[PDB]
Design an enzyme around this catalytic site. Structure first.
Site, mmCIF file in Angstrom:
data_model
loop_
_atom_site.group_PDB
_atom_site.id
_atom_site.type_symbol
_atom_site.label_atom_id
_atom_site.label_comp_id
_atom_site.label_asym_id
_atom_site.label_seq_id
_atom_site.Cartn_x
_atom_site.Cartn_y
_atom_site.Cartn_z
ATOM 1 N N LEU A 117 0.774 -1.243 0.000
ATOM 2 C CA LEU A 117 0.000 0.000 0.000
ATOM 3 C C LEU A 117 0.803 1.289 0.000
ATOM 4 C CD1 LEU A 117 -2.675 -1.139 2.536
ATOM 5 C CD2 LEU A 117 -2.532 -1.576 0.068
ATOM 6 N N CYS A 118 2.091 1.183 -0.298
ATOM 7 C CA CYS A 118 2.965 2.347 -0.335
ATOM 8 C C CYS A 118 2.716 3.140 -1.620
ATOM 9 C CB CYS A 118 4.426 1.888 -0.271
ATOM 10 S SG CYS A 118 5.642 3.207 -0.206
ATOM 11 N N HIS A 119 2.746 4.468 -1.521
ATOM 12 C CA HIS A 119 2.524 5.330 -2.683
ATOM 13 C C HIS A 119 3.761 5.541 -3.552
ATOM 14 C CE1 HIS A 119 -0.818 6.478 -0.034
ATOM 15 N NE2 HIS A 119 -1.436 6.935 -1.106
ATOM 16 N N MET B 116 8.736 4.789 4.927
ATOM 17 C CA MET B 116 8.948 3.441 4.394
ATOM 18 C C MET B 116 10.197 3.328 3.527
ATOM 19 S SD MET B 116 6.845 1.761 5.966
ATOM 20 C CE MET B 116 7.556 0.265 5.264
ATOM 21 N N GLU B 117 10.511 4.378 2.768
ATOM 22 C CA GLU B 117 11.707 4.363 1.921
ATOM 23 C C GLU B 117 12.963 4.302 2.791
ATOM 24 O OE1 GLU B 117 9.056 6.137 1.227
ATOM 25 O OE2 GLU B 117 8.610 5.534 -0.830
ATOM 26 N N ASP C 23 24.172 -11.054 3.166
ATOM 27 C CA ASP C 23 24.530 -11.813 1.970
ATOM 28 C C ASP C 23 26.031 -11.813 1.712
ATOM 29 O OD1 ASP C 23 23.837 -13.232 -0.581
ATOM 30 O OD2 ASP C 23 24.759 -11.442 -1.464
#
Lengths: 147, 147, 149, 148, 147, 147
Positions: E65-67, E103-104, E118
């Site tokens: 749901l991120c824009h 969120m970014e 990794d």
């Protein structure tokens, strides 16, 4: 020297434009296959032209520090220059943003060129992509630029 | 008509491909590079990683390219100072029904495009002189090397 | 009851194929524009056919529980059925894997149809995409299947 | 003629909205499975609804000449119309740009439908996505449009 | 309970900024390997830092749901805290939009951490990513915020 | 010491598996909001769980040196531990290839966690993804590993 997506947050959104070109030098085998419609994978020039447009849009996904931006225009031309035995690609990209679209135009030409290679390598693996370069760009404080 | 050539019934075999690309540098671009770049980070380091990432994104960029599991990817980006040129080399490996020439070529092309992005602030006239295949092995046609 | 990508790890890899089709119903204006080369964006059928091939490869990215797998073949046919005022799209995808490629074939047809819509909507927003359906599939335990309508 | 992403650089930015719908025809087997929670891959409607929202955002990557643009609003609704043996999907997308978002809405519905098929094909391979069509759009110079 | 993105068409456009951090706790083996340039895959910190920037740009693709938002700035730092036996990652994202970029920033740190993992898991599969958290954010209805 | 996608060309395709977990620390206001269905964006756990599955598939696109592989299985579990005011996430990825899927499992957990955060960010911006760690893996020469 640490990588970063340059902070452009306080700059104004201005109309930007960029034009680049690229060439694919053909062998006799490739040139012959080309004038016959390709090697069975389809029209080389047609597929490469569309690939260029698609590439312009995927530029931010391919160039690490490239800013993601809303493209407002994409034109791509892929033509055979028989006498010269080579394909010429030109691409012009436009947007309204805080950073230029030289990367989008350069990438469009490069990928269109790689697609020409893919569409003809069956005939000759020696084809060469040469001279991917910028021709013009406007917008941005540095103003107008033309090769 | 375009198509992803059917290779369903072809045997899986070891395949490798090596390509290269060059970026023509101006005096100003070289100066900037020697000083760590234009402020976006080390051009060569970001370009080398972009190349590996590009190898993996090849099937998404080249329309009729087959998506395949890569088993190895090497990319080298070196500055040839006196020549004022950046040389990019890439070798891709896999075990599949089709070769990886496109992966090697795409890796070099995108790494070159990234070198451009990392230095275009100093000079818009930088040129990706050429992108070409140097070697490929495996498959029906066997070994191929540039002469 | 919760979502999951079905475990097919112990299944043998086999040659698989799937064929689907889809239609885009045209208005007289759409048909007219189509016969004239499009609305100024380019040849609708040519761009759509290519979009379908690319779509097949991006299927796992669009369908949540779809298995990522290497496609070994993709054929897409986009043609105008003038008399029927319909555009017909057909796609056959192939692979060597533990699960079928019905989703790839269906997605290829659906996206090709969406592209036809995009290439002609400037002429008519009413164009309808219809009958996205599977026609054939083979490989795997279930064996062969074909729509006999 | 030649493919191109239409130049809309100098077009004034305005509010844009578009709504589309899609249907998936179900067999008795597919319906029966749907009611029981699916075929074992999870809730068909829940997964498809999310797929639609995600698909709206990926539109420019799927449609060659589509304009990439930030979306400010995305709504997707997936409902079962039991008696009709149909699953209906509706999607509304909004933004502020120089071009419309009809594609984003159409794509959201189409992919949601494809996901419903994926979530139920184990029950019936013959399931059909009957239609995908626009219902409304506003913004730009041509104003508003609504299906009959 | 129906998943629904938040309609932000009706919202004020302002300068947004968010800063997050994450940590990767190292075993003596990993620390040792890290101090020697890695496990043979390359410099863990360099590759992770770039991964963080790339992840910021891919946030809308990963978070349902991120824009989708044009990013105007991304800074990522991945540093070894030798005495504490851990790597600290910080990320700051900026933009001008109707929604925040928390969120970014969070995603940038999480993927950089995953990349550190990794690049060093060959030495120790037990390495732990810990404390992915927001440190600051400004803009938006809730006003400025700091941990 | 430069970045590279480790060459695994000569290794056989074998059944591979990996399981990881992550936790999201919940504040009081986030725990209540969760119990009532969220903050208006939908069910936090349902969206996060699917986000995890999608992330597993996008792992090669997020981790630079990660090998693109065909996945044969993905399971993701998102559960609320009321007593601990914590959300527990676990993911298992499987495949038949020349390299492990530990990154796929770790990434699925990390993104699912980021999604739980996105789905409750409105109630509390201070939520923390405490840890992300591998629990098990099998296949490959080094055999089975347990935390």
């Amino acid at each position: 020297g640490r990588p970063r997506m340059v902070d452009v947050t306080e700059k104004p959104e201005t109309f930007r434009t960029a034009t680049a070109e690229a060439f694919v030098e053909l062998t006799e085998e490739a040139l012959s296959a080309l004038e016959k419609g390709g090697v069975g994978k389809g029209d080389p020039l047609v597929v490469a032209q569309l690939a260029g447009i698609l590439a312009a849009k995927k530029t931010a996904d391919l160039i690490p520090l490239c800013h993601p931006l809303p493209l407002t225009g994409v034109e791509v031309r892929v033509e055979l220059l028989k006498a010269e035995k080579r394909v010429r690609i030109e691409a012009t990209v436009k947007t309204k943003a805080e950073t230029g679209v030289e990367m989008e135009a350069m990438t469009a030409c490069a990928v269109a060129a790689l697609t020409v290679y893919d569409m003809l390598k069956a005939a000759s693996k020696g084809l060469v992509i040469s001279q991917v370069r910028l021709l013009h760009k406007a917008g941005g404080k540095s103003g107008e630029w033309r090769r």
